Design a protein around this nucleic acid. Structure first.
Lengths: 100, 79, 150, 95, 108, 836
RNA sequence: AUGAUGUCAUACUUAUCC
């Protein structure tokens, strides 16, 4: 996204697990990364939500509280009918911040 | 049988997985064959277009559908 | 078949105290210090003090019947390799005035000899803080000795 | 090369190919190991094996010269076993 | 009765560029037999040396007495060298011949 | 930048000043490493890039030759390590065929990253080995890594196993299968088979849920080790079955099928660790069986499970613990049997102060106990563990406390009787009164307990809140924040039961602490006030808002991360809800104070800030406040500005922008550039929020976009293009396309550039323009560019044409022009020329 | 009179981040 450009999404097969968002990343969109116009809920992959991988945030990856949703601008642009956008990789973010 | 050609991966990049997207180094015949296959798939998918195509010809709907499915593989020949 | 026990192995104890050719037992505590009092080893084997060894100049002193472990041999065939260990260390005691502090005094404790030891014709047990002073009639052997140190 | 003809391991035996593969592995790698025998067992476990994948797995296993000869010797013996109506190579008819 | 980190190798520094291995062997030769000694002949490492003895306690008495010991105008830097890794510049090999020998001679 | 006294050995070659006379100059210039290792952060950045682009130049050989010693250094840092890992990655995104000789020479240093105490180190390591294996060839990896299988040390064998796990995740299971399946049947020595089996396991952990397709073949491999004469192979084998089944989500049961009958038999005869391992496997298996077969088999396992509670082995206790979870958490098991046989020994041996001090044992214990509650019911478990709330040690109290928490979370408090409830509330207060550390467990615990009890808690309030005030003094630093938060979470309960005196208490009492100088306390105080606002309404506030709000206003200077947070939040709640109680003058002062809150380093602060600014924008009306936004100096380049832009958007929503636009559009005139691109952004977010309503204002913005899109400097084209995007999605289908075509003209030249933000911007632009205008016009701009053999135009126009192609591929058919047929091929589609 | 590369400041973006 606009904050992390080197992050890669999962884009796996869509399952029946509804996605969730963390308390620090509440209200933020997954594709458009906006805060207004939520139109479609976020669905997670089957391998992305299993055991300890269930109930976690898609973007933040922390403890999910509320369910995540997609932006209406991404819904009208057909950017929400793609695969599961689970953040798998984590590069150049929250790595040197742990040392300080 | 040394081939020295292992199109496996590099750095989790590119790796085309879709069909009909195309590349910058795509040839003209490959793009024409992909456009013809997309046109055949759109003719097979749309019911009104298939009805308008079968009403003009003297053939039936299922025969024209089987002819369009049989002509999908190798429509031109040289890619 | 592998016989795992998860007990105290001897290699971790031998790597901590490693001598030249043998194991090193009878280690001193962390409260050891250099002695500054007027005390010298006066050995009298035949009522004549030929040798004299300074105990306050060295930190460790090992006497035995082996020439590879010890530095200087001793002419005592009735004494074992590890019979007695006289080491000076400042222990917790009280002076004559009543104030507490560090006093350099020799520590006397038996190391578990096979025949024991005797001092002033009396046997002393280990793990007991005895009042050790100068000019004591000790014995540097397991059974008996014809030489005393002062 | 010799790895372009389609073959099938279901029409050939497996017990007669173990000694020739063991001799080829002892000639290539010098000694006897357990990873190369397991790789040769896994390469013939499928009913329709892949000659190019086996050559890549054994094409670099050695140095890149004895493995090509080993693949060319294993493809011809398997071809002679699959072409025969019995299902055995030429080295098993004499002994 | 020794700290584990100390090793038979000692890194020694604050050396002159003219210094002679005669003085080296003489001085360091007090504590025990020299396993061997290296000296930097290279632009950065000139002025430095490594000493290795047949025994560790040799080196222990060395750094004991040689601590801040003097040569010319200089007080040498005497430290216990840290060779945790083998720089892998060299390899692990050539075990086969010697092990075959001990398996041959003594037969064990 | 400086050299540590040891690093000289590595960098000595740089010290000598001999200069300017081949490869020796490449090693000499390669000391840019030193700039990466030690130096200022900018030196590290610029150095890092410079060495990235020189990869293809220098080659992998010199680099690794000059790196691997450093990453091998005995004195290596944490950071320095991580940084050298970074350079290895970034250079391995480029070099592909080159690394083949160095692969092992890499892994030897890298495999120690896989086994490490640091987690981020592990995910990094797995990542870079993934990039290496995928980067190199399969046969490269395989042929490389064989000799480490039989290596004497087991360390290299283990970390090597995890290596094969990573590479197998890279290149997939089926490609690597025959290798493994060959390994586990190796007849030389056992150590190999041990390794390969461990590989099966680590594949199970890593791949996890995705093992599913090849599960059968994998099992067929591993099965032959269970009966082997050696022990290890048996143990690690059955363990690997465990890992499989655990990643084996409720299915593939019959694939494990042939494995069972030996296992059960082994369950009889084994002493020691292998036994426990089998119990681990069988444990994860049982949920995958049928409640009939698993009835029998389970009832058999229960015996040994009982007998084996008492072993001192902690591995044992872990296993048998999780087992008890799965076996006794089975729907096909009877309550009373557990209640009698299990619970008394369970709470006897398992609940002790050996366990709780450990971490994993703590958690797993919590879970298992939770599930036993899930079956036998609530009052049992809780009733037995309540008495331990009053136990001395903390960690133990913490344990039973969170246990009670989860229990009453799931089952509900309805089952609980009266007396045990007295012991409950007293237990929870007592435990809460002694807190050595600050943590949520006690608090969330209390809150969940009370909210679960509902109004059965009412007789207990005065004791609660008495404790709440007295503690609300004691120690402000430590406990003030905590008692405050306690109020915050107990608000609703202190409300619905209709104790009004208590709301007077908390209202003015908390009101008084707003002068507290310690921020970490004050924050919790404001939070408590917040929660009290959400229960009792505006006009009923015992501290009437006229009092409260201006008393809040000065606090905004407070810098503090928690004060600012809760404060701005509360100003938001009151500013949104009542908003009449306070006169406008106070409000506009609040504005001029809010303006500099946008220096916050936190995103949520700015969030609440902007939303509030919208609320008060409603309380007053647009013109003044949007003017106060346009006052902004823009002074900070890295953001700190565009939040004001967002405020301009939301303000333009809160009352109709149908009013506001002329002021803004006029304010583009100003010669100061960064605020020009600022108001461009304001249009962008503006259309993003307004959506449909842009069916009118498109025209108004059109010529200005003309002026902006015509380039003064790149940011104009970029931001303006984003505006075209959001406008283009918003207006869709309403018939305004014409002017959007006109704007598309000026959009079109910007197609060419290498700047990432402008090219991705333009991409979004032309995508929105695709949907709005329709593909036909797009394609009519994208035709001629395809052809171009020039290494640029074709790259781009094919990128575009792909973007147009993926979506709306169905509707493109009509618009492909007529293309004449050549010799070998017929390029005319005659179907469209059939005429009735 | 564009363009070329290179030492070297200066603004801007990524809702970048303790």
């Amino acid at each position: 996204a606009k904050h992390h450009p080197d992050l890669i999404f999962c884009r796996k097969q869509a399952g029946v697990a509804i996605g969730r968002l963390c308390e620090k990343c509440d209200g933020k969109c997954v594709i458009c990364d906006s805060y207004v116009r939520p139109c479609t809920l976020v669905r997670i992959c089957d391998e992305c939500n299993y055991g300890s991988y269930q109930g976690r945030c898609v973007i933040c990856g922390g403890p999910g509280v509320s369910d995540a949703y997609y932006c209406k601008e991404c819904t009208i642009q057909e950017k929400d009918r793609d695969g599961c956008p689970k953040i798998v990789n984590l590069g150049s973010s929250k790595t040197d911040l742990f040392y300080e | 049988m040394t081939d020295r050609y292992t199109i496996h991966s590099q750095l989790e990049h590119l790796q085309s997985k879709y069909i009909g997207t195309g590349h910058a180094d795509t040839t003209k015949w490959e793009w024409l064959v992909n456009q013809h296959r997309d046109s055949y798939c759109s003719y097979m998918g749309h019911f009104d277009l298939l009805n308008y195509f079968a009403i003009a010809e003297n053939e039936s709907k299922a025969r024209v559908r089987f002819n369009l499915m049989e002509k999908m593989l190798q429509p031109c020949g040289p890619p | 078949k592998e016989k795992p026990s998860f007990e105290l192995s001897g290699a971790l104890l031998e790597d901590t105290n490693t001598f030249r050719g043998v194991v090193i037992k009878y280690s001193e505590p962390p409260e050891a210090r250099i002695p500054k009092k007027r005390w010298r080893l006066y050995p009298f084997k035949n009522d004549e003090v030929l040798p004299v060894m300074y105990i306050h100049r060295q930190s460790a002193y090992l006497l035995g019947r082996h020439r590879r472990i010890a530095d200087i041999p001793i002419d005592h065939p009735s004494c074992s390799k590890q019979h007695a260990v006289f080491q000076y260390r400042l222990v917790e005691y009280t002076r004559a005035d009543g104030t507490v502090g560090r006093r350099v005094k020799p520590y006397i404790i038996d190391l578990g000899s096979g025949n024991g030891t005797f001092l002033n014709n009396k046997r002393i047990e280990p793990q007991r803080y005895y009042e050790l002073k100068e000019k004591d009639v000790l014995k540097f052997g397991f059974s008996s000795r014809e030489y005393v140190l002062l | 090369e010799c790895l372009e003809k389609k073959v099938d391991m279901s029409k050939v035996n497996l017990e007669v190919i173990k000694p020739w593969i063991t001799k080829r592995v002892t000639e290539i790698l010098g000694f006897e190991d357990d990873v190369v025998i397991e790789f040769i067992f896994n390469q013939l476990e499928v009913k329709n094996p892949d000659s190019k994948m086996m050559q890549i797995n054994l094409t670099g296993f050695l140095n890149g010269k004895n493995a090509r000869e080993f693949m060319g010797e294993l493809w011809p013996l398997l071809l002679s076993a699959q072409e025969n109506i019995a299902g055995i190579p030429s080295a098993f008819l004499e002994l | 009765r020794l700290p584990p980190e100390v090793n038979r190798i000692l890194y020694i520094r604050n050396l002159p560029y003219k210094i002679t291995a005669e003085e080296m062997y003489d001085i360091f030769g007090k504590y025990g037999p020299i396993r061997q000694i290296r000296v930097g002949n290279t632009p950065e490492t000139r002025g430095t040396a490594y000493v290795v003895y047949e025994d560790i306690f040799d080196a222990k008495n060395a750094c004991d007495h040689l601590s801040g010991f003097n040569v010319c105008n200089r007080y040498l830097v005497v430290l216990y060298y840290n060779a945790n890794r083998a720089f892998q510049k060299m390899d692990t090999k050539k075990k086969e011949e010697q092990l075959k020998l001990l398996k041959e001679k003594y037969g064990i | 930048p400086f050299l540590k006294p040891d690093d000289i050995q590595y960098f000595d070659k740089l010290l000598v000043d001999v200069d300017e006379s081949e490869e020796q100059k490449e090693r000499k210039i390669m000391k840019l490493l030193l700039k990466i290792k030690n130096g200022t952060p900018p030196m590290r950045k610029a150095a890092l890039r410079q060495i990235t682009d020189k990869a293809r130049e220098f080659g992998a050989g010199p680099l690794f030759n000059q790196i691997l010693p450093l990453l091998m250094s005995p004195t290596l840092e944490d950071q320095e390590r991580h940084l050298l890992v970074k350079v290895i990655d970034r250079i391995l995104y480029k070099l592909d065929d080159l690394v083949r000789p160095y692969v092992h020479k890499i892994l030897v240093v890298i495999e120690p990253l896989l086994i490490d105490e640091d987690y981020y180190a592990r995910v990094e390591g797995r990542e870079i080995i993934s990039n290496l294996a995928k980067a190199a060839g399969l046969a490269t990896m395989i042929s490389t890594m064989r000799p480490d299988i039989d290596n004497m040390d087991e360390y290299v064998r283990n970390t090597t196993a995890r290596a094969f796990a990573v590479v197998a995740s890279a290149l997939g299971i089926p490609s690597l299968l025959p290798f493994l399946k060959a390994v586990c049947k190796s007849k030389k020595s056992w150590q190999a088979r041990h390794t390969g089996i461990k590989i099966v396991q680590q594949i199970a952990i890593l791949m996890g849920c995705a093992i599913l397709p090849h599960l059968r073949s994998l099992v067929e491999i591993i099965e032959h080790g269970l009966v082997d004469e050696q022990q290890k192979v048996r143990t690690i084998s059955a363990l690997a079955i465990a890992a499989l089944a655990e990643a084996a989500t409720p299915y593939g049961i019959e694939s494990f099928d042939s494995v069972l009958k030996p296992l059960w038999k082994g369950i009889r005869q084994h002493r020691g660790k292998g036994l426990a391992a089998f119990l681990k496997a069988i444990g994860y298996l049982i949920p995958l069986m049928d409640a009939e077969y698993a009835n029998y088999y389970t009832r058999e396992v229960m015996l040994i499970l009982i007998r084996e509670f008492q072993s001192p082995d902690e591995e044992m206790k872990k296993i048998v613990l999780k087992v008890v979870k799965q076996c006794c958490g089975t729907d096909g098991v009877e309550a009373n049997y557990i209640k009698t046989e299990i619970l008394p020994p369970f709470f006897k041996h398992f609940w002790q102060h050996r366990m709780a001090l450990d971490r994993r044992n703590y958690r797993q214990l919590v879970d298992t106990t939770v599930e036993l509650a899930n079956k036998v019911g609530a009052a049992e478990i809780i009733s037995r563990i309540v008495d331990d709330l009053k136990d001395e040690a903390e960690q133990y109290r913490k344990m039973v406390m969170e246990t009670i928490e989860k229990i009453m979370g799931n089952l509900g408090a309805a089952d609980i009787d009266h007396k045990l409830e007295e012991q409950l509330i007293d237990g929870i207060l007592y435990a809460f009164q002694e807190q050595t550390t600050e943590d949520s467990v006690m608090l969330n615990g209390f809150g969940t307990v009370v909210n679960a009890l509902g109004k059965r808690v009412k007789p207990y309030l005065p004791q609660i809140c008495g404790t709440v005030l007295w503690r609300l003094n004691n120690k402000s630093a430590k406990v003030r924040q905590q008692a405050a938060d306690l109020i915050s979470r107990t608000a609703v309960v202190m409300k619905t039961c209709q104790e009004e005196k208590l709301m007077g208490h908390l209202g003015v009492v908390l009101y008084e602490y707003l002068g507290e100088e310690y921020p970490e306390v004050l924050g919790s105080i404001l939070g408590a006030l917040k929660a009290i606002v959400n229960v009792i309404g505006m006009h009923k506030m015992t501290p009437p808002i006229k009092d409260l709000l201006p008393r809040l206003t000065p606090i905004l200077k407070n810098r503090h991360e928690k004060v600012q947070e809760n404060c701005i939040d509360l100003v938001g709640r009151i500013a949104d809800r009542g908003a009449e109680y306070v006169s406008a003058r106070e409000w506009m002062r609040i504005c001029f104070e809010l303006l500099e809150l946008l220096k916050a380093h936190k995103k949520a602060i700015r969030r609440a800030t902007v939303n509030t600014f919208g609320y008060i924008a409603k309380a007053i009306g647009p013109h003044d406040v949007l003017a106060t936004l346009l006052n902004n100096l823009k002074v900070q380049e890295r953001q700190n500005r565009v939040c004001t832009t967002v405020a301009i958007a939301i303000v333009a929503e809160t009352c109709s922008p149908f009013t506001v636009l002329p002021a803004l559009m006029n304010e583009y005139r100003v010669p100061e550039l960064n605020v020009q691109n600022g108001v461009l952004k304001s249009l962008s977010f503006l259309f993003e929020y307004i959506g449909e309503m842009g069916k009118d204002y498109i025209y108004a913005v059109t010529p200005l976009l003309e002026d902006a899109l015509m380039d003064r400097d790149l940011v104009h084209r970029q931001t303006a293009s984003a505006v075209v995007q959001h406008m283009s999605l918003g207006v869709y289908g309403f018939g305004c396309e014409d002017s959007l075509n006109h704007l598309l003209n000026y959009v079109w030249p910007n197609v060419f550039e290498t700047s990432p933000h402008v090219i991705q911007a333009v991409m979004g632009a032309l995508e929105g323009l695709r949907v709005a205008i329709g593909p036909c016009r797009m394609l009519q701009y994208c035709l001629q560019g395809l052809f171009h053999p020039a290494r640029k135009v074709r790259d781009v126009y094919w990128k575009i044409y792909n973007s147009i192609y993926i979506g709306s591929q169905d509707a493109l058919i009509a618009h492909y022009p007529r293309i004449y047929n050549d010799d070998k091929n017929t390029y005319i589609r005659y179907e469209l020329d059939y005429i009735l």
